[PDB]
Amino acid sequence: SEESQAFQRQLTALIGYDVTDVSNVHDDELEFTRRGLVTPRMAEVASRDPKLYAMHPWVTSKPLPEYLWKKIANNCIFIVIHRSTTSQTIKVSPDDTPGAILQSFFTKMAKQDFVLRVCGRDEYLVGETPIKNFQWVRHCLKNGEEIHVVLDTPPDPALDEVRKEEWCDRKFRVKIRGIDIPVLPRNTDLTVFVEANIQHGQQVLCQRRTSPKPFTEEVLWNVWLEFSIKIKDLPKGALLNLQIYCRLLYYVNLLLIDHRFLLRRGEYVLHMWQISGFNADKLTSATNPDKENSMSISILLDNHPIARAEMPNQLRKQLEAIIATDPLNPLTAEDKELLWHFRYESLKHPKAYPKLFSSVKWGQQEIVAKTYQLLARREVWDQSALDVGLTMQLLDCNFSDENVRAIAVQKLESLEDDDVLHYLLQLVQAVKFEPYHDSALARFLLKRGLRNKRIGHFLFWFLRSEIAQSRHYQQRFAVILEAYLRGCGTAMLHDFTQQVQVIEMLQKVTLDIKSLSAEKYDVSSQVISQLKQKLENLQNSQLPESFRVPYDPGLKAGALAIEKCKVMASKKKPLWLEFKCADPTALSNETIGIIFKHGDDLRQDMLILQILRIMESIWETESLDLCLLPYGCISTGDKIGMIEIVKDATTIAKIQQSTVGNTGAFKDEVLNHWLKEKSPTEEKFQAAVERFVYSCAGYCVATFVLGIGDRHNDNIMITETGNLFHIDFGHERVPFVLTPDFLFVMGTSGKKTSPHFQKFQDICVKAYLALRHHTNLLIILFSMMLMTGMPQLTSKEDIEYIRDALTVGKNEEDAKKYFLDQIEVCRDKGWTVQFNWFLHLVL
Ligand SMILES: Cn1nc(-c2ccc3ccccc3c2)c2c(N)ncnc21
């Protein structure tokens, strides 16, 4: 039918990639995956609750933190209801349901159903949850704000209507025909060979090379390469990894067993990727779509189907020591055999699972069989509490077995939406380690996306971020995105369509302004002449009357406040943009600000930010509030995207450059004077200093742990109310920024104590050693972030940074000492590093 074609064209535009294109395919796995995803999509669409889906309550079952209870001194929360500029303050208990709040409101007033939607937002307080367990309500207690809510008819679930969809015992060998590239690289005669690896879980099962031969535009081997492995022994998910050295310069992969469990057969011309000059990109089954410029390799496959007793005391100790070791500790051959031979004892310990499944000889069919027989008695696994870190380890690059990876996904099923949103970006990224496009993990995300509008919204942008930037995975991620968009509802398709149209227009402007003033330090009259003009043009006949803010979907932006818009003064040339709020019932006349920037990898900013939210949650469990300010941030395209504007905030550099701004000179007292001038009462001034002690502690700890502590002042900011925050993560050493200006806010001076600095040390140590309780989780997030987020990274050195930073293997005293020593390094150093930046620019 024809309105099936139109709808596909809608989807192509939303996706930014055409999932029906079959130009860059060696087989039909992508189509098979489109059709396969119809079933789980339709299931979750059919079975989701219409009312709660439309209203997407944002809710948690975690206990209300100690520090928020303190903020309720009386067991009564205050809630201002509105009708149409009439309002009443209803007293309410924290265990009151929204249903029960409405019985007490209606009785108060009068003496056909409605819902309490938050003022100024598409956000609702509904369902059988205490109000204290709604996230909006926790956001208002933490910030000392009044819960303002308005009364109206529930939104029509009809609006969310989903359109009806219409739909052998021989050694393995490959023949290397040759390699072809139309133009030669670096252009001196070197030698070149082809390495062929059989790989499973980044484990090399077997390896053969061709001879060296003169690297010309066209090189021919015509050699059968015989491997040590039998055909019947190739495991599902095994890759033929073909690489070219002279040293690693080109790579490509071919799944040996296909999505129908069939051995791969025939002629292949595979167009390869080129290394830049270990990482998720190296694992991709996708070929280079640029058929014209790229290096290609020709191969021939012509090889069909296929689908106790008591352990001694000291060996168990040896086993228990191996199990209790961090995820980045190399297993020895002895360690592996021990794990394997006493696999049944190892299965009683859910934490052994990663090491145990990585002690498996995946290139032996009988062993694989025994492993499946092993996982069939999963009772201890199935009954253990969800340990998100342990589970993420099974979804990383070290596991290619479908059955291992699925018991990890099974575990995730018990995460509330709350917890999914925390892990969503890393779970999306973990799709890069799937052997096949259709996976249990792909389907989990699809299912949870379709179940909750909030998760769907972020799932869309996280998927779309990769589809627009990585050639290596765009095909895979586009098929997943299309499956989502096909079940999300007509209201969300429209909302997404508006959003994409807004940033397509705005990125356009962003690049055009860059070219007008090159690097040169100042933003001219003539440059803030055009920005206004381009905005006026866009608004009056192109740019939507209203769009959802991608980084904060509850908020709806309206018309540009053109006066407040400007080009920012940096060497890259970002748009600072302010919008009116579309919602007539907002409390404030205040603007939604958004920065558009081209220049750096905003995906890296996304990654760090997410780990930061996770860190605030670990700290929440142990009743700590460190007041991070993880700003909203979405990568939309190649080195380009949006960033939330934090209000009443300025950079540390800027505060320093105001009374003076000479050449690298800094002043100890301005930060403290600045806070004093921003606080109209001594009350708010001491509340400022206190938030500075906490937020500064949070960022020092967090930031040390992730190896990003050494920043120029340019990329550290503060709000008027004392909240320090780091920015631009995508952009003699020091473990973190605790400069003498920060110390003087803390009442301290050049090697000496004070009460706020005693406190600062106190909070750092509590904060540090609380992350250390979650060491394995952090090690896996860091490790995955490096692999899916950066350029080429060190399958030891770069990744092992975190273990030494988390001071793995030490008692709580050595760890407290160690961090306290780090504080002292920033003290000795003072201004050294900040000054050096300026010294360097002449270098
Ligand atoms: C002066 N300034 N600079 C930024 C800013 C913050 C975060 C960024 C993250 C990546 C790239 C540029 C960025 C730019 C910024 C911001 N996000 N909110 C309010 N004021 C701000």
From Swiss-Prot:
Question: Where is the stretch described as G-loop?
Answer: 567-573
Q: Which InterPro entries match?
A: ARM-type_fold, C2_domain_sf, Kinase-like_dom_sf, PI3/4_kinase_cat_dom, PI3/4_kinase_cat_sf, PI3/4_kinase_CS, PI3K-type_C2_dom, PI3K_ABD
Task: Give the reaction(s) catalysed.
Answer: a 1,2-diacyl-sn-glycero-3-phospho-(1D-myo-inositol) + ATP = a 1,2-diacyl-sn-glycero-3-phospho-(1D-myo-inositol-3-phosphate) + ADP + H(+); a 1,2-diacyl-sn-glycero-3-phospho-(1D-myo-inositol-4,5-bisphosphate) + ATP = a 1,2-diacyl-sn-glycero-3-phospho-(1D-myo-inositol-3,4,5-trisphosphate) + ADP + H(+); a 1,2-diacyl-sn-glycero-3-phospho-(1D-myo-inositol 4-phosphate) + ATP = a 1,2-diacyl-sn-glycero-3-phospho-(1D-myo-inositol-3,4-bisphosphate) + ADP + H(+); L-seryl-[protein] + ATP = O-phospho-L-seryl-[protein] + ADP + H(+)
**Binding-site positions, ATP:** 593-602, 628-636, 725-731
The UniProt keywords, alphabetically, are: Angiogenesis, ATP-binding, Cell membrane, Chemotaxis, Cytoplasm, Disease variant, Endocytosis, Immunity, Inflammatory response, Kinase, Lipid metabolism, Membrane, Nucleotide-binding, Phosphoprotein, Serine/threonine-protein kinase, Transferase
Domain C2 PI3K-type span(s) in chain numbering: 168-302
Task: Tell me a Gene Ontology molecular-function term this record carries.
Answer: identical protein binding
**What cellular component terms from Gene Ontology apply here?**
cytoplasm; cytosol; membrane; phosphatidylinositol 3-kinase complex, class IA; phosphatidylinositol 3-kinase complex, class IB; plasma membrane
Residue ranges annotated for the PI3K-RBD domain, each copy included: 74-153
Per its UniProt record, which disorder involves this protein?
Answer: Immunodeficiency 97 with autoinflammation: An autosomal recessive disorder with variable features. Affected individuals have childhood-onset antibody defects, cytopenias, and T lymphocytic pneumonitis and colitis. Some patients may have features of hemophagocytic lymphohistiocytosis.
Protein name, UniProt field: Phosphatidylinositol 4,5-bisphosphate 3-kinase catalytic subunit gamma isoform
